[PDB]
Design a protein around this ligand. Structure first.
Ligand SMILES: Cc1cc2nc3c(=O)[nH]c(=O)nc-3n(C[C@H](O)[C@H](O)[C@H](O)COP(=O)(O)OP(=O)(O)OC[C@H]3O[C@@H](n4cnc5c(N)ncnc54)[C@H](O)[C@@H]3O)c2cc1C
Ligand SMILES: Cc1cc2nc3c(=O)[nH]c(=O)nc-3n(C[C@H](O)[C@H](O)[C@H](O)COP(=O)(O)OP(=O)(O)OC[C@H]3O[C@@H](n4cnc5c(N)ncnc54)[C@H](O)[C@@H]3O)c2cc1C
Ligand code: SF4
Ligand code: SF4
Ligand code: SF4
Ligand code: SF4
Ligand code: SF4
Ligand code: SF4
Ligand code: SF4
Ligand code: SF4
Ligand code: SF4
Ligand code: SF4
Ligand code: SF4
Ligand code: SF4
Ligand code: SF4
Ligand code: FES
Lengths: 137, 189, 296, 662, 420, 95
């Protein structure tokens, strides 16, 4: 009756390329994550993550370039600081902060993208349904 | 090499020298990889290992040939080779391999498999006997006890030569792997 | 005064006790305290026992390590082969979890556990380190110059190699051991292929004595050509090979060298004033008397 | 809004993983969707015709194509959307192949169908909120810059100049030419390198469209495809060219290259051109064939004795107090041609490079064998100056090596140049024998295999074994090379008089600094990265920057020149047009929502944001040319006063909402 | 750059060999996927006059004006533009496929190296750039079913003849490519005589998902899936016997590594054996590709294949050589043998380069002006070389050479004057 | 391999297996080239000859090894090899 709802927000220049490379190389993984594709992860506002979690994302993933490998010289440092602060907010509002993570996937790491997909799915399955969906009523 | 004739000297003389795909033992290769903890399947036969070996200039021992046998799975060619026990484990090959392989670790794994199939020189078994009895590969004798006394040291070192209660623990360790029960059996012959 | 558990393997106590006696005395003269290891055994000798069974090699080396773990002390060694066994099993079991598990459930039959809390040092490594006794402290402790003696160093193989597994630096032409011999006042000489194996490792000493002796004889020829008056070494295996094997070479071949073979601890004792009788130089196959005439 | 959904089968690549019929029916029942339809190959001409017919018939506002990746087919379907009466940017893709089919092929079909429905729903939700953008066109300055004066830089500069574009040629060293100027002969044809290159050096030096700036570096670069404001450091050469002397007022001239200055200078230092084998004074030229024959002064080693100025006399070319001058130049495109250096092979201690006298590397051998080198072209042993009779060549020295010391790649030309050097020794010293310790002879190019055949015919010995270690004989200084002859099956001990290491190559010194100034990334190997490894080996991901030569990866002089001309053509494409269109992803400030806090200003790496006066209120101002569309500022601004043009917050939030719609 | 350009192609579609490739070394990208974008650009560019299925009859002139006469071969089918010009408002060919659905003639497809059928009216593959459905007049029987199927579009003109056009051009770029050397001459490898011996372009079509099979590599002899595949490297190359080529074909070591990877990943448990004599992975990321293939578990046997025998019943192939590093002869029995054959200049390339006045190399490829410092231009002014026609090369090197040639051809056009 | 011991069995056991440049006989190579009338110095050790030999699968005879000995001048290694008389002169290698 329950299937995890995981949302990914992946940059265009390394994480979308890595997911595309995994697909091209035919690396299988479970069909639980759906992606949004912004240009950089610097674009990811905090309110995007919080909006996802309040609509009912059982998990949220944000994937971007490695440090020093952003297409736009430093846009993922901003995203990293923002996601550290988001981890702190979710812990202090009492939602489980491991529902959220930020992975750094390069353009050539299709295998690592597959492993990230598998691990995110496993972690959310262990965690269970998000509590917001029943706390709303 | 036409077929088996069952005349042992002619079989030895006309042994098929030609490698077939029936000669490969992937299980042998996987056991070697596991035991050696090295990337042995990645050798590209540069010859640096043999060029550095100190045993090669005076024998038929070729570590590169052993690496090739490991890669191709030539069990019963690698294990029965009498030049498997000429490696001094000097680690020069491992020091210089461009692929980060430990050929001497491959040699060690091969020696373990040879022991498990009962090919092993007798000095190894005698050392097993000595370590089982006293815990020491090179044990003390009367003349060395006298020499130590004349020096001023105790007649026996602080080892299991003077604390024989740890010998029982050493013996249980050896018996768990059955090393003594195999060494004595092989020696009996 | 730094304190270390003194492992003391098989050959030094049972064939060359002067090596261990001088080890304790000289280490105490410099700021090091060598404590007996309680019931230590053969470090499962890496060649003759590792060639047979790696799992029992691991188990016995781990037992030797957990003795000093219970003692809560750092191991100090004087043998390159013992260093290989003890230090390398310590390093492997500090990082490989399934091997830790296997060794621990083997050792649990004797009420004994490995946790990986101590470090393993070679005595020459300690003598070279600057935090512990350094080269300058060795020079200070030296009281008999030992001048006018040409001395050839044999590093061995299991201390420094492979350099991807150790931390002593260059294996092609190290000079650190040459500095320790130069501290004593003896001039260390360089010979062809100085980093060659002595031939006794891996059980070859037992399996094929002629092969091992040929490997040793290549070294002895190079050393005589250089003009050495003694061969310092940091391994009782290598000392046994260079000492017995000279006699076996004299009998199996027709080669005579009469080159004394001494452990570095024995030379350090000679430099610090210990007597030849107190060093038991009469227990070597090759007479040291010409070298003693030169340096005394 | 009215959206059309067109679902490609990709010729069973997608229909073999999901139910396309079900996806299409779901798209039909989706809100805002006017038409939903499918086709086998939507990227083909019938597919574009299908899109266009649907647009015309159903009066479509936007188009959603459920197909392969946007990174593969945005241009195709944007042009298909334009042809049909829409804006190109009323289009959005739903990647249901490379992220649905190829990853959920096996044993899971209704799950892949549900994922496809979700992706189509999110795409439709975004496209129902997309609106019209027009790409920005920016003018292109009609100049070009080429950094590097090697063969690749000189070829690119000559190509651009002869196409008519004014070009700057920046070289850090006092002369152009590069490594090929150091080469003595060239494989596979055995031509003299300087003889074939000097004509082209003269062309570069005389071309009116080339501004040759030697002994100059690039301090900083800012700008974009349109205008690059490049600041150059004119290092204090210490000597004036005739033009600069006349400008400063000295009628008699500047430097004519007479050589009296270096004839009287008392300082003597190693010559970097000769890899240190040869002396040169404090005032010097590398070799007699340098293109600007202008005699740099080495100020790190000059003692200001003033003898040089007395020797120069009335020419008055020497100014010992000269300082680093800075110049700012505006250019349209830039070509990077930084070349390479030899990997430090003294780290491989088993081959006693620095510790044995008679072990050298291949550029030192090339200088020793050249007739213009420190010797009179006579190869002699460094240890004693005697002529060698046996020479060993260690191929793969530090290459195809995974130990962490050497390089894991092949340096491409080291097998060929070792064959050349073996030929040169066997023909220059009568009776000398060349031994090549090799591990895969790699003679792949045109006439290379024939060159290999000819060298073996002349009698070089090929021993297939990687050298294990090298020992030096204490008295004769001869080198004992130990390896195994893998084909013979025995160890060997070859005693040679001279050992030559064919060392690996690595990116030049400072190349990483320069490519970070220009915004170029690096490869796995450490060389500069190209836009697409197959179909675009010259351009980089940053627009207006192009690669040429060994700086992108090791190559022979033929391949280097082909790459250099390709880069010159790519750099000429936007200059000849004069326009170039930027992607309309810029940030746009909504002023009557900006509060003027100024906090976003420091979040732009490109300094596109600033605080300015509009209607009395202090609001933020975007330099739309400098913006690159990253979105950092617009993801920061708390009040929502920054709008990202094709990825607006309402659009992204509509995508999120559509994902959670059930 | 702005110059109007004519693109002459003898075949009904652009693309070349890279359109036949399945995946590309060392990046393993799909060849059609990376090239289809550029084919669309060429087909849409207003400055390019794409003239497919056309040859060059004669060339006269010089650097200034080349009076080039083209032969527009009778395609048999009208593009929409030509149909409107001739007066048919309804259009020409839209690529529906009804014609080939009803054609009764069936002939081998040269794009699929003959493995696959195609009607008398046909396209090579579904991704051809001009999707215009040539008629093969050497094999058409003029049954007229195709015109009835085409109907009101009226795109098919079965009586069309070779039209001739004369075009004046300033410069010319030659990019004729290559073909595979005929390896049936090397009788010891039973290429034509044993069923399960193929060459590398046939293997690439068999392994492609758009090929005659559904992308499934099967044995030609019986249609069963192979489990052991051998790759004979250097097949006809570095050979001084007079049968093969004395040069290296440059890319055959790399494409054999690619094919070994493809079989080991597509057939679970299949093993690839490469009988090699100098693995040549010299380019960027090539050595890493070689390392990765060995890691995935291809067997590298350093020995040139001596001869191949076919088992009479199983149709398996016994490959005989020596493992030179092991030091023993070998007899590896494989289900499928792939020959990495040498490449040679395309058919008719010598005729075309004599029309344009270009000479040949020792190797037989077109000669360049200066082998080091001018690898694109030829000695005859106004003619430039690009691609494998000047010598074998990978797609990266080919593209660099092509852009270099385009730059050299643009130099005199942009100036507008040349001095003789 | 340290030196000559003059104990024949130990000399046989510890024969120096390591090729030196003193082992090459260019006169031997030139005599072979003259008598054979073939370009033997141009072998690049591909192994086709051994792969085709009918004597190789049943003996230690390696024609490629003999070619290598010819190239390197290993007289007293080639001539004394008892597998010099196992060639049937079938000419498959030459073919
Ligand atoms: C020993 C040896 C022998 C060779 N023999 C041959 C042969 O026979 N035939 C052959 O075809 N190839 C040969 N090659 C290869 C050949 O040298 C290269 O293909 C070629 O030189 C590549 O030239 P390049 O312009 O790309 O780089 P380079 O020649 O290295 O030129 C780069 C230039 O850029 C300058 N530069 C670097 N960084 C900066 C900076 N930050 N700012 C400004 N300027 C900068 C450098 O000073 C230099 O002038 C050989 C290579 C070696 C090492
Ligand atoms: C089996 C195989 C696998 C390969 N794999 C790879 C790989 O993975 N990666 C890689 O980078 N490279 C690979 N290559 C090499 C690659 O195919 C070439 O680098 C590339 O195709 C060169 O293209 P080209 O345009 O020069 O020649 P071609 O692709 O042959 O194109 C020449 C074109 O000109 C046409 N033509 C010929 N003569 C005339 C004429 N007289 N008039 C008009 N038109 C004419 C031909 O019909 C053809 O369309 C492979 C090669 C082979 C054989
Ligand atoms: S050195 Fe390493 S790569 Fe070379 S042959 Fe030995 S094991 Fe193989
Ligand atoms: S470890 Fe063994 S194989 Fe390696 S060099 Fe030493 S003796 Fe030779
Ligand atoms: S648009 Fe993409 S999915 Fe559709 S046919 Fe073309 S390549 Fe395949
Ligand atoms: S003396 Fe003056 S003019 Fe002559 S080379 Fe020197 S600087 Fe130039
Ligand atoms: S000032 Fe003196 S040291 Fe400097 S270049 Fe002139 S002569 Fe030489
Ligand atoms: S080009 Fe030749 S020598 Fe250089 S790294 Fe590659 S294989 Fe080795
Ligand atoms: S756009 Fe936002 S962050 Fe920037 S100045 Fe205005 S209110 Fe501040
Ligand atoms: S999106 Fe914002 S931060 Fe990024 S470049 Fe444009 S203005 Fe600067
Ligand atoms: S039926 Fe007519 S329009 Fe359709 S593909 Fe055939 S020729 Fe073209
Ligand atoms: S006329 Fe007949 S044979 Fe020819 S293409 Fe049409 S249907 Fe086929
Ligand atoms: S590229 Fe490789 S397979 Fe092709 S001819 Fe050259 S060496 Fe042989
Ligand atoms: S002689 Fe034998 S090994 Fe040498 S090239 Fe000829 S076939 Fe190959
Ligand atoms: S002639 Fe026949 S038997 Fe003699 S080497 Fe050649 S193949 Fe072998
Ligand atoms: S481009 Fe991917 S994180 Fe910035």
């Amino acid at each position: 009756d329950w299937k995890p709802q995981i949302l990914a927000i992946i940059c265009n220049w390394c994480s979308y390329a890595g997911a595309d490379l995994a697909g091209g190389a035919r690396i299988q993984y479970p069909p639980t994550v759906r992606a949004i594709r912004v240009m950089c992860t610097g674009r990811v506002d905090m309110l995007f993550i919080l909006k996802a979690f309040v609509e009912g994302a059982d998990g949220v993933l944000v994937s971007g370039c490695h440090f020093g490998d952003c297409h736009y010289l430093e846009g993922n440092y901003k995203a990293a600081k923002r996601m550290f602060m988001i981890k702190n907010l979710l812990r202090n509002i009492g939602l489980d902060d491991r529902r959220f993570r930020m992975t750094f996937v390069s353009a050539s790491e299709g295998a690592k993208w597959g492993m990230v997909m598998e691990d995110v799915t496993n972690t959310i399955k262990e965690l269970g349904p998000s509590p917001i969906k029943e706390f709303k009523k | 090499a036409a077929k088996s004739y069952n005349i042992p000297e002619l079989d030895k003389k006309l042994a098929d020298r030609r490698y077939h795909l029936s000669d490969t033992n992937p299980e042998f290769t996987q056991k070697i990889l596991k035991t050696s903890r090295t990337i042995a399947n990645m050798c590209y036969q540069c010859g640096t290992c043999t060029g550095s070996c100190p045993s090669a200039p005076r024998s038929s021992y070729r570590i590169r040939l052993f690496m090739r046998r490991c890669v191709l799975g030539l069990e019963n060619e690698a294990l029965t080779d009498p030049d498997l026990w000429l490696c001094t484990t000097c680690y020069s090959c491992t020091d210089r391999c461009p692929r980060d392989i430990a050929p001497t670790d491959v040699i060690m794994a091969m020696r373990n498999l040879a022991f498990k199939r009962d090919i092993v020189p007798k000095n190894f078994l005698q050392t097993v006997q000595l370590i089982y009895n006293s815990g020491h590969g090179v044990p003390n004798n009367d003349v060395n006890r006298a020499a130590r006394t004349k020096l001023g040291l105790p007649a026996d070192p602080p080892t299991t030569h003077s604390y024989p209660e740890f010998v029982k623990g050493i013996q249980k360790i050896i018996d768990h792997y059955e090393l003594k029960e195999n060494a004595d059996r092989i020696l009996k012959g | 005064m730094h304190e270390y558990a003194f492992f003391l393997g098989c050959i030094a106590p049972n064939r060359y006790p002067g090596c261990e006696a001088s080890a304790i005395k000289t280490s105490e003269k410099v700021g090091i305290k060598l404590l007996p290891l309680k019931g230590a055994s053969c470090c499962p000798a890496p060649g003759a026992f590792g060639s047979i069974d790696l799992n029992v090699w691991y188990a016995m080396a781990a037992r030797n390590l957990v003795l000093a773990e219970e003692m809560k002390k750092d191991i100090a060694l004087i043998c390159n082969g013992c260093y290989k066994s003890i230090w390398e099993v310590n390093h492997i079991l500090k990082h490989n979890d399934e091997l830790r598990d296997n060794v621990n459930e083997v050792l649990a039959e004797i009420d004994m556990q490995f946790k990986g809390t101590i470090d393993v040092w070679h005595l020459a490594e300690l003598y070279y380190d600057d935090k512990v006794c350094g080269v300058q402290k060795i020079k200070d402790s030296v009281t008999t110059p030992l001048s006018g003696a040409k001395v050839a160093a044999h590093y061995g193989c299991h201390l420094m190699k492979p350099k991807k597994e150790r931390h002593f630096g260059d294996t092609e032409n190290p000079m650190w051991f040459e500095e320790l011999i130069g501290a004593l006042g003896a001039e260390p000489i360089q010979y062809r292929n100085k980093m060659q194996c002595c031939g006794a490792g891996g059980g070859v000493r037992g399996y094929d004595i002629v092969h091992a002796l040929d490997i040793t004889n290549e070294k002895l020829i190079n050393i005589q050509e250089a003009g050495a008056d003694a061969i310092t070494e940091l391994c009782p295996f290598c000392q046994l090979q260079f000492d017995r094997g000279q006699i076996e070479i004299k009998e199996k071949f027709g080669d005579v060298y009469n080159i004394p073979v001494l452990h570095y601890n024995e030379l350090l004792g000679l430099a610090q004033g210990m007597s030849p009788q107190d060093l038991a130089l009469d227990l070597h196959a090759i007479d040291c008397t010409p070298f003693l005439q030169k340096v005394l | 809004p009215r959206i059309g959904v067109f679902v490609c089968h990709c010729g069973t690549n997608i229909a073999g993983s999901m139910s396309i019929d079900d996806v299409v029916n779901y798209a039909k029942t989706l809100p805002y969707v006017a038409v939903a339809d499918q086709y086998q190959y939507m990227c083909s001409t019938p597919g574009q015709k299908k899109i266009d017919d649907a647009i015309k018939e159903y009066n479509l506002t936007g188009v959603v194509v459920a197909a392969c990746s946007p990174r593969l087919h945005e241009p195709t379907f944007r042009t298909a959307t334009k042809e049909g009466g829409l804006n190109p940017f009323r289009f959005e893709m739903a990647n249901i192949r490379e992220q649905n089919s190829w990853v959920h092929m096996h044993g899971m079909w209704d799950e892949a169908t549900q994922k496809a429905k979700d992706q189509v729903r999110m795409a439709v939700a975004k496209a129902a909120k997309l609106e019209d953008l027009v790409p920005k066109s920016v003018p292109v300055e009609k100049t070009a810059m080429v950094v590097g004066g090697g063969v690749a830089g000189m070829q690119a500069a000559l190509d651009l100049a002869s196409a008519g574009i004014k070009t700057y040629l920046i070289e850090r060293t006092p002369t152009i030419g590069g490594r090929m100027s150091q080469l003595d002969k060239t494989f596979p044809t055995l031509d003299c390198s300087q003889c074939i290159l000097t004509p082209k050096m003269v062309d570069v030096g005389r071309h009116p469209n080339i501004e040759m700036m030697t002994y100059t570096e690039v301090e900083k670069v800012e700008g974009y495809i349109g205008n690059f404001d490049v600041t150059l450091r004119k290092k204090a050469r210490g000597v004036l060219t005739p033009t600069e002397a006349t400008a400063k007022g000295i009628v008699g001239g500047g430097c004519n290259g007479c050589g009296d200055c270096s004839a009287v200078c008392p300082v003597i230092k190693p010559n970097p051109f000769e890899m240190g084998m040869a002396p040169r004074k404090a005032i010097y030229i590398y070799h007699a064939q340098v293109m600007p024959l202008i005699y740099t002064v080495d100020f790190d080693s000059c003692v200001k004795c003033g003898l040089c100025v007395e020797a120069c006399g009335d020419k008055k070319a020497i100014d010992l107090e000269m300082q680093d001058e800075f110049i700012t130049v505006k250019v349209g495109t830039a070509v990077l041609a930084t070349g390479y250096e030899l990997f430090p092979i003294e780290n491989k201690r088993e081959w006693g490079y620095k510790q044995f006298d008679n072990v050298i590397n291949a550029l030192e051998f090339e200088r020793l064998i050249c007739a213009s080198g420190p010797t009179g072209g006579h190869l002699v042993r460094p240890s004693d100056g005697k002529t060698p009779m046996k020479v060993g060549f260690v191929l793969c020295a530090g290459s195809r090596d995974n130990t962490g010391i050497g390089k894991p790649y092949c340096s491409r030309f080291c097998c060929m140049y070792s064959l050349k050097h073996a030929h040169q020794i066997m023909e220059k010293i009568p009776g000398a024998v060349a031994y090549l310790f090799y591990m895969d002879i790699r003679s792949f190019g045109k006439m290379y295999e024939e060159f290999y055949y000819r060298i073996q015919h002349e009698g070089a010995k090929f021993i297939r074994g990687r050298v294990a270690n090298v020992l030096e004989d204490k008295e004769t200084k001869n080198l004992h090379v130990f390896t195994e002859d893998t084909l013979l099956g025995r160890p060997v001990d070859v005693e040679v008089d001279l050992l030559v290491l064919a060392a690996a190559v690595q990116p030049n010194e400072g190349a990483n600094e320069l490519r970070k100034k220009f915004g170029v990334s690096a490869s796995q190997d450490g060389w500069m990265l190209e836009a697409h490894p197959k179909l675009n080996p010259c351009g980089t991901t940053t627009a207006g920057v192009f690669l040429a030569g060994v700086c992108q990866g090791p190559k022979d002089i033929p391949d280097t020149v082909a790459q250099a001309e390709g880069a010159a053509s790519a750099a000429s494409i936007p200059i000849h047009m004069g326009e170039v269109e930027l992607e309309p992803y810029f940030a746009m400030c909504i002023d009557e929502l900006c509060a003027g806090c100024g906090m976003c200003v420091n979040l732009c790496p490109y300094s596109a944001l600033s605080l300015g006066e509009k209607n009395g209120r202090t609001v933020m101002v975007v330099t739309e040319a400098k913006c690159k569309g990253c979105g950092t500022c617009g993801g920061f601004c708390p009040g929502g006063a920054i709008k990202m043009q094709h990825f607006t917050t309402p659009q992204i939030v509509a995508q999120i909402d559509a994902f959670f719609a059930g």
